[PDB]
Amino acid sequence: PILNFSGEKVGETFLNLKTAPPEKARAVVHRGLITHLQNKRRGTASTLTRAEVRGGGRKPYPQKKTGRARRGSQGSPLRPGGGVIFGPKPRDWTIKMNKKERRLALSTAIASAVGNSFVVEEFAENFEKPKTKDFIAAMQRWGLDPAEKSLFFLMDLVENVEKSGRNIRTLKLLTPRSLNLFDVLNAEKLVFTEGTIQYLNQRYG
């Protein structure tokens, strides 16, 4: 396809964006999502085994000559009060994936995200103070809608535009620093800058 543009509210469509996805492997994007989700997960689920428990290390009653079944400890993993046999422990979940597989995964979701995608021309010279009002006005100009979800790819992120953008929850401003695979799936409408197209078209083509 070919993408659209917006000077400041009016179209003049040009830049094309070439990028390399696979063919019969959406599975690559799935894997790249799953890895992302796993490595993040904090993993703070902690239980005590029968060793670690605060409890008496002693036979309560003798082995023979009572009708009771032979007991080892009272903090045993069959009584309530101390046990938890194969219980979770403070455990890391960080799995590897290759470099090129991650990069390819990032490329494929973006490649399939053009269609919904969008581009603008620089607009950092508008905002002198930080203003959310003007920002939302510019959203409704472009027609991105405070209801729907959006991801602003912005090659060089400016202070005043970032601060105005912060408190819109549905919105999500991203440098190439904090580029994310989860997010490019998260968004309904992507919205690039001319520099961004040069970056992605160069780096992933």
Partner: peptide, 14 residues
Amino acid sequence: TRFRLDNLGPQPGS
């Protein structure tokens, strides 16, 4: 058809 967190799944057998 565009990729989202709705759509994704593994390939058969992996």
